[PDB]
Design a protein around this motif. Structure first.
Motif, PDB file in Angstrom:
ATOM      1  N   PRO A 262      71.571  39.183  84.074  1.00 40.55           N
ATOM      2  CA  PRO A 262      70.140  39.284  83.767  1.00 40.55           C
ATOM      3  C   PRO A 262      69.488  40.517  84.357  1.00 40.55           C
ATOM      4  O   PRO A 262      68.865  40.448  85.418  1.00 40.55           O
ATOM      5  N   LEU A 263      69.624  41.649  83.683  1.00 45.26           N
ATOM      6  CA  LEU A 263      68.975  42.861  84.145  1.00 45.26           C
ATOM      7  C   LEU A 263      67.500  42.843  83.769  1.00 45.26           C
ATOM      8  O   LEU A 263      67.113  42.406  82.681  1.00 45.26           O
ATOM      9  N   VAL A 264      66.673  43.342  84.687  1.00 44.09           N
ATOM     10  CA  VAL A 264      65.226  43.249  84.530  1.00 44.09           C
ATOM     11  C   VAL A 264      64.731  44.186  83.437  1.00 44.09           C
ATOM     12  O   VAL A 264      63.863  43.815  82.639  1.00 44.09           O
ATOM     13  N   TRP A 265      65.309  45.380  83.341  1.00 45.71           N
ATOM     14  CA  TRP A 265      64.891  46.331  82.322  1.00 45.71           C
ATOM     15  C   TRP A 265      65.246  45.872  80.917  1.00 45.71           C
ATOM     16  O   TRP A 265      64.416  45.979  80.009  1.00 45.71           O
ATOM     17  N   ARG A 266      66.450  45.345  80.718  1.00 50.57           N
ATOM     18  CA  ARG A 266      66.813  44.832  79.407  1.00 50.57           C
ATOM     19  C   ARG A 266      66.130  43.514  79.091  1.00 50.57           C
ATOM     20  O   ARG A 266      65.966  43.188  77.914  1.00 50.57           O
ATOM     21  N   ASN A 267      65.741  42.742  80.099  1.00 54.47           N
ATOM     22  CA  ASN A 267      65.073  41.475  79.858  1.00 54.47           C
ATOM     23  C   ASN A 267      63.563  41.602  79.749  1.00 54.47           C
ATOM     24  O   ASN A 267      62.894  40.605  79.469  1.00 54.47           O
ATOM     25  N   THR A 268      63.002  42.784  79.987  1.00 57.72           N
ATOM     26  CA  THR A 268      61.613  43.012  79.612  1.00 57.72           C
ATOM     27  C   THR A 268      61.425  43.975  78.453  1.00 57.72           C
ATOM     28  O   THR A 268      60.444  43.836  77.723  1.00 57.72           O
ATOM     29  N   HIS A 269      62.330  44.936  78.242  1.00 61.26           N
ATOM     30  CA  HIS A 269      61.958  45.903  77.222  1.00 61.26           C
ATOM     31  C   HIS A 269      62.869  45.833  76.006  1.00 61.26           C
ATOM     32  O   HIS A 269      64.091  45.754  76.150  1.00 61.26           O
ATOM     33  N   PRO A 270      62.307  45.886  74.805  1.00 61.22           N
ATOM     34  CA  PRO A 270      63.115  45.706  73.597  1.00 61.22           C
ATOM     35  C   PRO A 270      63.785  46.978  73.106  1.00 61.22           C
ATOM     36  O   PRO A 270      63.117  47.962  72.794  1.00 61.22           O
ATOM     37  N   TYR A 271      65.107  46.970  73.005  1.00 62.32           N
ATOM     38  CA  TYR A 271      65.845  48.156  72.610  1.00 62.32           C
ATOM     39  C   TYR A 271      66.691  47.855  71.386  1.00 62.32           C
ATOM     40  O   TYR A 271      66.781  46.716  70.925  1.00 62.32           O
ATOM     41  N   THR A 272      67.306  48.906  70.855  1.00 67.87           N
ATOM     42  CA  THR A 272      68.032  48.861  69.596  1.00 67.87           C
ATOM     43  C   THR A 272      68.951  50.068  69.582  1.00 67.87           C
ATOM     44  O   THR A 272      68.561  51.145  70.030  1.00 67.87           O
ATOM     45  N   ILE A 273      70.182  49.887  69.124  1.00 67.03           N
ATOM     46  CA  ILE A 273      71.144  50.977  69.050  1.00 67.03           C
ATOM     47  C   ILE A 273      71.500  51.164  67.591  1.00 67.03           C
ATOM     48  O   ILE A 273      72.018  50.239  66.953  1.00 67.03           O
ATOM     49  N   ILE A 274      71.233  52.355  67.065  1.00 64.54           N
ATOM     50  CA  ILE A 274      71.138  52.554  65.624  1.00 64.54           C
ATOM     51  C   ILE A 274      72.531  52.552  65.012  1.00 64.54           C
ATOM     52  O   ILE A 274      73.369  53.393  65.338  1.00 64.54           O
ATOM     53  N   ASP A 275      72.775  51.599  64.114  1.00 61.94           N
ATOM     54  CA  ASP A 275      74.062  51.535  63.437  1.00 61.94           C
ATOM     55  C   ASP A 275      74.098  52.462  62.232  1.00 61.94           C
ATOM     56  O   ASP A 275      75.115  53.105  61.973  1.00 61.94           O
ATOM     57  N   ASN A 276      73.002  52.546  61.482  1.00 62.00           N
ATOM     58  CA  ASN A 276      72.974  53.324  60.249  1.00 62.00           C
ATOM     59  C   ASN A 276      71.726  54.191  60.196  1.00 62.00           C
ATOM     60  O   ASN A 276      70.632  53.731  60.529  1.00 62.00           O
ATOM     61  N   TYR A 277      71.888  55.433  59.753  1.00 64.61           N
ATOM     62  CA  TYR A 277      70.802  56.397  59.671  1.00 64.61           C
ATOM     63  C   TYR A 277      70.646  56.871  58.234  1.00 64.61           C
ATOM     64  O   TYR A 277      71.641  57.112  57.545  1.00 64.61           O
ATOM     65  N   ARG A 278      69.402  57.023  57.786  1.00 59.28           N
ATOM     66  CA  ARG A 278      69.160  57.539  56.448  1.00 59.28           C
ATOM     67  C   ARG A 278      67.815  58.253  56.429  1.00 59.28           C
ATOM     68  O   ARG A 278      66.868  57.836  57.095  1.00 59.28           O
ATOM     69  N   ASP A 279      67.746  59.341  55.668  1.00 62.23           N
ATOM     70  CA  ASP A 279      66.559  60.186  55.558  1.00 62.23           C
ATOM     71  C   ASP A 279      65.821  59.831  54.271  1.00 62.23           C
ATOM     72  O   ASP A 279      66.203  60.288  53.191  1.00 62.23           O
ATOM     73  N   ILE A 280      64.757  59.036  54.371  1.00 63.90           N
ATOM     74  CA  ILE A 280      64.001  58.645  53.186  1.00 63.90           C
ATOM     75  C   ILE A 280      62.796  59.574  53.071  1.00 63.90           C
ATOM     76  O   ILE A 280      61.687  59.237  53.481  1.00 63.90           O
ATOM     77  N   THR A 281      63.002  60.729  52.447  1.00 60.83           N
ATOM     78  CA  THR A 281      61.964  61.745  52.355  1.00 60.83           C
ATOM     79  C   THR A 281      61.914  62.222  50.914  1.00 60.83           C
ATOM     80  O   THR A 281      62.956  62.324  50.263  1.00 60.83           O
ATOM     81  N   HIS A 282      60.716  62.488  50.413  1.00 65.62           N
ATOM     82  CA  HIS A 282      60.582  62.912  49.031  1.00 65.62           C
ATOM     83  C   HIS A 282      61.068  64.349  48.867  1.00 65.62           C
ATOM     84  O   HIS A 282      60.673  65.232  49.650  1.00 65.62           O
ATOM     85  N   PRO A 283      61.930  64.622  47.884  1.00 64.58           N
ATOM     86  CA  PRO A 283      62.405  65.995  47.671  1.00 64.58           C
ATOM     87  C   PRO A 283      61.320  66.966  47.244  1.00 64.58           C
ATOM     88  O   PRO A 283      61.511  68.170  47.423  1.00 64.58           O
ATOM     89  N   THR A 284      60.182  66.495  46.728  1.00 63.78           N
ATOM     90  CA  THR A 284      59.044  67.391  46.544  1.00 63.78           C
ATOM     91  C   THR A 284      58.493  67.868  47.885  1.00 63.78           C
ATOM     92  O   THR A 284      58.131  69.042  48.030  1.00 63.78           O
ATOM     93  N   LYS A 285      58.465  66.986  48.890  1.00 62.07           N
ATOM     94  CA  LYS A 285      58.047  67.394  50.227  1.00 62.07           C
ATOM     95  C   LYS A 285      59.061  68.323  50.867  1.00 62.07           C
ATOM     96  O   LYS A 285      58.677  69.279  51.553  1.00 62.07           O
ATOM     97  N   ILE A 286      60.351  68.062  50.653  1.00 60.48           N
ATOM     98  CA  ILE A 286      61.376  68.951  51.191  1.00 60.48           C
ATOM     99  C   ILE A 286      61.381  70.305  50.483  1.00 60.48           C
ATOM    100  O   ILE A 286      61.637  71.333  51.123  1.00 60.48           O
ATOM    101  N   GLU A 287      61.042  70.345  49.194  1.00 62.00           N
ATOM    102  CA  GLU A 287      60.972  71.606  48.469  1.00 62.00           C
ATOM    103  C   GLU A 287      59.720  72.393  48.830  1.00 62.00           C
ATOM    104  O   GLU A 287      59.748  73.628  48.850  1.00 62.00           O
ATOM    105  N   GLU A 288      58.612  71.701  49.100  1.00 65.40           N
ATOM    106  CA  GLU A 288      57.408  72.385  49.553  1.00 65.40           C
ATOM    107  C   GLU A 288      57.598  72.940  50.959  1.00 65.40           C
ATOM    108  O   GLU A 288      57.573  74.159  51.168  1.00 65.40           O
ATOM    109  N   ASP A 289      57.811  72.062  51.935  1.00 62.60           N
ATOM    110  CA  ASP A 289      58.039  72.496  53.308  1.00 62.60           C
ATOM    111  C   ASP A 289      59.452  72.123  53.717  1.00 62.60           C
ATOM    112  O   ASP A 289      59.760  70.926  53.833  1.00 62.60           O
TER     113      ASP A 289
END
Ligand SMILES: Nc1nc2c(ncn2[C@@H]2O[C@H](COP(=O)(O)OP(=O)(O)OP(=O)(O)O)[C@@H](O)[C@H]2O)c(=O)[nH]1
Ligand SMILES: [Mg+2]
Lengths: 293, 74, 96, 88, 232, 92, 159, 54
Positions: free
Chosen positions: A195-222
């Motif tokens: 029972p660690l105090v930091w893990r038992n008070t703060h909510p964490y998450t370790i990312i299994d999957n990553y994806r970039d959901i961005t509009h290609p019009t936004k990527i083409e503009e900037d």
RNA sequence: AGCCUGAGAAACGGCUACUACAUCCAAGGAAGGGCAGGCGCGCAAAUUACCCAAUCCCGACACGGGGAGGUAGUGACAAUAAAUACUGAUACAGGGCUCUUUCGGGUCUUGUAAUUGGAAUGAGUACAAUUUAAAUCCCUUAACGAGGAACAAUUGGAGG
């Protein structure tokens, strides 16, 4: 009388501080780090462990790898890269530690650095020393001398009487099956995390999957603009806030949650499917590596 | 191209005090303790240490004190 | 205490943390709460610089004190599974 | 048995919640108790700098932590520090 | 599969042959009155080293026991079996000593040709024929009609017929093969009936020690006439 | 390199000559039992191939070394009468 | 006590011993021998037990060279001592035979394998040398004081 | 003298004999101060009286 | 509860029915009932080692097969032996030590972080050969292997 004395000494040994558990009924996969100096074979142990468990020969395993090891509990293996930022990022994250030592070469500063980083941040339940490159030896008297001195230095480092496994050879590019089978005998049957105090008070998450959901019009503009990112992983600490949770993505900075979708598991672990037999049929040995092959 | 572990981490010395080269070997310490306790004995009693030398009798070489009675009075 | 030789405890509050003179026994004494029985007893850290390793809410082993406050009976031996003299001698780091 | 009494009081509180927000889905299970631990979840983060997506390597993992209300404020932290034993 | 100490004290084993000991296979002589061929070859004579070496001796036709080739390794050879080895050209004979152990005796063909066997019983077999049973479980059909119980017989061993016989006699020297006075070559001087079971004989040595042994445990060897060469 | 043979036994039914061998290297290292098989060809008028050496414990303080040597009448008699491990150590 | 400390220090200095465990070891075996002698003096003279067991004890001590060949009574076996045992040790015998310059030189020689007792070299300085074997203490043949190679610092210097 | 008879080598003791013979020192009062043995003065001394009476 | 084989069993090896668990399925059906290991608090301490090579056993049978047996690994719980140095010369300083009795008595060679010189070497590294089922250990063994800032002695207590 001496039986009463020994009983009182053990009854005083059993005690600790009453800290809070904060573990759910359907618990998340326990996180296994594979930490060590560069060139010691963390990726090789990762390949060998996932072939032991889920029989899948991964040619290049990256990211967290979730694995069903029992009907109640499951694991996830993450190999720490050779950078101190990742080591300090995962030492506060790790549930059990697989700490690799390079045999004939002896101890390394990266091993001692992670040991005292972990001890200062928060000590987990189980750390297992794994000693490899034993086949790079010529005298089997020097071999047992090196095993004895590395065992005693590791016992001084973390605690007396630890588990130090010796992985001898590299046969098929993978590891010996009997050695990794007793290693998995030790890391398969499990006890609840400390029972660690930091893990038992703060909510964490370790990312299994990553994806970039961005509009290609936004990527083409900037071409260099603020993007939106879908990160999929297991919620591990306490529960997230329903709206407006502030997030530190470690190594990037602080943001806020724009959306949480809470969806069913990809590794169901048959207690959650049936919600008293021992063995695991091969229906259940699932592999969820959404970044690996 | 590996980071060697150095002697301070290799044996966990910590903050043990500084001790002597005489104290690192238990025989040599008990040799020097006997040489200095045999030396303290000559300053209390009188050792024989050979009779007259080969040169003969060169006088009582360190004083003669007349008013000193050094006999165990029975 | 009890029937055992060493007891465990929780460091409630380092009483005398604001004392002036460095090696005062009021500076060295620490109020702990024993786990098995529940009572709050006072124990001596062996040294004033060694007081800094004792943090609040830490599992602390304590033994008798056999020889400025005469009558405080216990002394802190281990803190969080690591020996306190080893922490003071800088042999081990404290797992928290 | 003060240790087991304290641990039993902690388990009593840990039964009182999950007994108290086991009464409604859209109100309690979604909005009161948040998004409970252990469940797989997909996060949408808005406003990430594009250098992260250009320099994203799958080796170095991503850890998402939840800041508290106190962990976003700045100020003078007074700390108790000591150099390491093996730092030269 | 008995242990080396549970093996009997009369076929000797030293501190060498492991903790275990071979058991004799079932055959003519008994279990506790027995010397197996492996103990005779590699533990007594030391013509061999190992079990596989003893097998490589036995399986080829090089060891003949009582004039016939005995192949299996733990074949029982208890008492007075002539053991002919032809490549060495020797014939050994098994007798006892005065202390109560097995003894080997080297001899050539002239004394190797016959066997002195003690008659166990005489009966009328099938066909209305008298037959004779020795202690080697040799049955001889149509014997000489005076050879009664406890008489010994010179068996031919090339045909197996009777050649001579020695009668049970008070005044004929005998050999003890059992009991608390085991292995004591002396002369039968008295015999007591004790009808109702377990009759005895009183027997003295060459040098005046009287003792009582049972008529089962006795074994006639000759009046003076040492028809087998007791070792000098 | 000084050789003496004690307790030479004939053994014709196993067809092999049994020698307790006491060899001595004073001042040399150990004897190299394959070269000892080569040495036990002209000492007993045989081929090298029909000799097998085992035992061979060196006495305390150098010099003496006690081995056990077996010379067979033919290499095929060696082949049919030798153990597998001694045949492997000899090289056949 | 100061008497025990000064006595053990006199033993450790006069015979070049390492600690007080060697002194206590010798005092234990001496007390065992002396207890056997006292138990044999409990019985009367001309008892066969006392006769043969005391003759065995006295012949054993004379053969291992502690007790002198002049005095052979059980009262002198009671009057035995730890200075006689430490005199029968090997290290003081090397110092007294004069192969070494001091007792610590003798311990150094016996440790690094120069002397031999009879045939075999002796690595232990507490080897209880018997009276028959006292004469055959000399430098071994593999030692540079005995012969063979000129040795180590000699080889590094002569190169 | 048992290694020249049929000249098979021996295992230099084992774990089960060394368990036995080193336990024999645990229950005996013998000691070997030098080349000789020093026997205890128990029942070995009483046989000397027990033989001489007969 | 009942039965079957065989020289030898009421084998528990199989079958049948009932009872009680429990698995796969295409929902018609179908196979099955041991020990060893870890946890037994959230905090812990002896190998998942190798082979039938010896002794022994079973078979159509020299070869095939053996969970007895032997080999190895850990171990500061004890117990055993003992390294971490040995030996000189020169130079210089005049004090070193002690106590009952203390502004007093007792004794006479002691030092130094001084300058130099000799040798000795086992821990370790190690070619081999040997040991052995194959290895290891042991015994043999060529070659290296000591100047302190090291091949790095510790645990306690008292005091300036
Ligand atoms: N002989 C021997 N070789 C090993 C052992 N373990 C790993 N190797 C080799 O060492 C190399 C290192 O590969 P990895 O194990 O992937 O190195 P890693 O540190 O795990 O991966 P990176 O962190 O990306 O370097 C591999 O090619 C292995 O074949 C071992 O126990 N013995
Ligand atoms: Mg990797």
């Amino acid at each position: 009388a001496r039986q009463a004395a020994r009983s009182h000494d053990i009854k005083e040994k059993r005690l600790h501080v009453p800290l809070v558990d904060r573990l759910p009924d359907e618990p998340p996969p326990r996180l296994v780090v594979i930490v060590g100096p560069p060139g010691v074979g963390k990726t090789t142990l990762l390949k060998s462990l996932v072939r032991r468990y889920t029989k899948e020969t991964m040619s290049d395993p990256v990211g967290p790898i979730t694995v069903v090891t029992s009907k109640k509990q499951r694991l996830t293996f993450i190999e720490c890269p050779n950078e101190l930022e990742a080591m300090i990022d995962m030492a506060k994250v790790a549930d059990i530690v697989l700490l690799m030592i390079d045999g004939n070469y002896g101890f390394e500063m990266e091993t001692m650095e992670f040991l005292n980083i972990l001890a200062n941040t928060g000590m987990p339940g189980n750390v297992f020393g794994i000693l490899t490159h034993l086949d790079l030896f010529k005298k089997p008297s020097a071999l047992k001398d090196a095993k004895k001195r590395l065992k005693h230095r590791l016992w001084t480092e973390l605690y007396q009487g630890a588990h130090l496994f010796y992985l001898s050879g590299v046969l098929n590019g993978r590891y010996p099956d009997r050695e990794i089978h007793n290693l998995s005998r030790f890391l398969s049957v499990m006890k609840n995390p400390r029972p660690l105090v930091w893990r038992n008070t703060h909510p964490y998450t370790i990312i299994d999957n990553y994806r970039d959901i961005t509009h290609p019009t936004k990527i083409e503009e900037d071409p260099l603009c603020d993007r939106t990112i879908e990160l999929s992983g297991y919620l591990r600490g306490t529960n997230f806030a329903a709206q407006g949770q502030r997030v530190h993505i470690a190594g990037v900075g602080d943001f806020t949650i724009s959306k949480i979708e809470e969806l069913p598991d990809p590794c169901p672990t048959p207690a959650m499917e049936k919600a008293p037999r021992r063995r695991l049929d091969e229906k259940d040995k699932k592999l969820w590596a959404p970044m690996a092959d | 191209g590996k980071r060697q572990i150095t002697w301070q981490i290799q044996k966990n010395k910590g903050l043990t005090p500084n001790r002597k080269k005489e104290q690192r070997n238990p025989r040599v310490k008990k040799r020097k303790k006997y040489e200095e306790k045999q030396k303290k004995l000559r300053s209390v009693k009188a050792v024989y240490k050979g009779g007259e030398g080969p040169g003969g009798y060169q006088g009582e070489l360190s004083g003669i004190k007349t008013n000193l009675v050094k006999s165990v009075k029975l | 205490f009890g029937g055992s030789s060493h007891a465990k405890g929780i460091v409630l509050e380092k009483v005398g943390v604001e004392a002036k003179q460095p090696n005062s026994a009021i500076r060295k004494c620490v109020r702990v709460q024993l786990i098995k029985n529940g009572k709050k007893v006072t124990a001596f850290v062996p040294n004033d610089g060694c007081l800094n390793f004792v943090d609040e809410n830490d599992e602390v082993l304590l033994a008798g004190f056999g020889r400025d406050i005469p009558g405080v009976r216990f002394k802190v031996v281990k803190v969080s599974g690591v020996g306190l003299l080893a922490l003071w001698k800088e042999k081990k780091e404290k797992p928290r | 048995q003060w240790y087991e009494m304290q641990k039993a009081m902690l388990q009593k509180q840990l039964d009182i919640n999950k007994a108290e927000y086991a009464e409604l889905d859209e109100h309690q299970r979604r909005q009161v108790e948040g998004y409970r631990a252990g469940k797989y979840a997909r996060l949408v983060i808005e406003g990430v700098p594009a250098e992260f997506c250009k320099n994203f390597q799958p080796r170095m993992p991503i850890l998402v932590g939840g800041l508290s209300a106190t962990e976003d404020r700045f100020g003078f932290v007074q700390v108790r520090i000591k150099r390491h034993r093996w730092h030269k | 599969h008995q242990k080396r100490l549970s093996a009997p004290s009369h076929w000797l084993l030293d501190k060498l042959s492991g903790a275990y000991a071979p058991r004799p296979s079932t055959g003519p002589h008994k279990l506790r009155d027995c010397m197996p061929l492996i103990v005779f070859v590699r533990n007594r004579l030391k013509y061999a080293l190992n079990y596989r070496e003893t097998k490589a001796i036995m399986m080829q036709r090089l060891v003949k026991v009582d004039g016939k080739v005995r192949t299996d390794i733990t074949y029982p050879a208890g008492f007075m079996d002539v053991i002919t080895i032809e490549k060495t050209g020797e014939n050994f004979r098994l007798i006892y000593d005065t202390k109560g152990r097995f003894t080997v005796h080297r001899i050539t063909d002239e004394e190797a040709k016959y066997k002195l066997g003690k008659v166990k019983r005489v009966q009328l077999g099938r066909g209305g024929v008298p037959f004779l049973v020795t202690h080697d479980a040799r049955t001889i059909r149509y014997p000489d009609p005076l050879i009664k119980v406890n008489d010994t017989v010179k068996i031919d061993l090339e045909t197996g017929k009777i050649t001579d016989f020695i009668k049970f006699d008070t005044g004929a020297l005998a050999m003890i093969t059992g009991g608390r006075n085991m292995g004591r070559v002396g002369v039968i001087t008295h015999r007591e009936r004790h009808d109702g079971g377990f009759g005895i004989v009183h027997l003295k040595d060459a040098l005046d020690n009287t003792f009582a042994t049972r008529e089962s445990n006795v074994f006639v060897i000759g009046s003076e006439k040492p028809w087998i060469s007791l070792p000098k | 390199v000084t050789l003496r043979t004690r307790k030479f036994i004939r053994n014709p039914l196993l067809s092999r000559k049994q020698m307790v061998v006491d060899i001595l290297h004073p001042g040399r290292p150990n004897i190299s039992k394959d070269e000892l098989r080569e040495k036990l060809a002209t000492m007993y008028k045989a081929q090298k191939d029909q000799v097998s050496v085992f035992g061979l414990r060196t006495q305390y303080g150098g010099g003496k070394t006690t081995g056990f040597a077996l010379i067979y009448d033919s290499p095929e008699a060696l082949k049919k009468f030798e153990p597998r491990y001694r045949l492997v150590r000899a090289g056949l | 006590e100061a008497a025990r400390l000064d006595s053990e220090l006199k033993l450790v200095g006069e015979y070049g011993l390492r600690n007080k465990r060697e002194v206590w070891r010798v005092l234990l075996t001496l007390s065992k021998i002396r207890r056997a002698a006292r138990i044999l003096l409990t019985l009367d003279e001309k008892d066969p037990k006392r006769l043969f067991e005391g003759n065995a004890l006295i012949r054993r001590l004379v053969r291992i060279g502690v007790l002198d060949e002049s005095r052979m009574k059980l009262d002198y076996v009671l009057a035995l001592k730890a200075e006689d045992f430490l005199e029968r040790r090997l290290q003081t015998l090397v110092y007294k035979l004069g192969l070494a310059k001091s007792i610590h030189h003798a311990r150094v020689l016996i440790r690094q394998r120069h002397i031999r007792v009879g045939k075999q070299i002796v690595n232990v300085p507490s080897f209880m040398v018997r009276l028959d074997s006292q004469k055959h203490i000399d430098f071994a043949l593999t030692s540079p004081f005995g012969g063979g190679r000129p040795g180590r610092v000699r080889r590094k210097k002569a190169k | 003298e048992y290694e020249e008879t049929n000249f098979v080598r021996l295992p230099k003791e084992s774990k089960k004999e060394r368990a036995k013979r080193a336990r024999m020192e645990g229950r005996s009062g013998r000691m070997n101060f030098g080349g000789e043995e020093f026997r205890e003065l128990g029942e070995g001394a009483e046989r000397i009286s027990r033989l001489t009476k007969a």
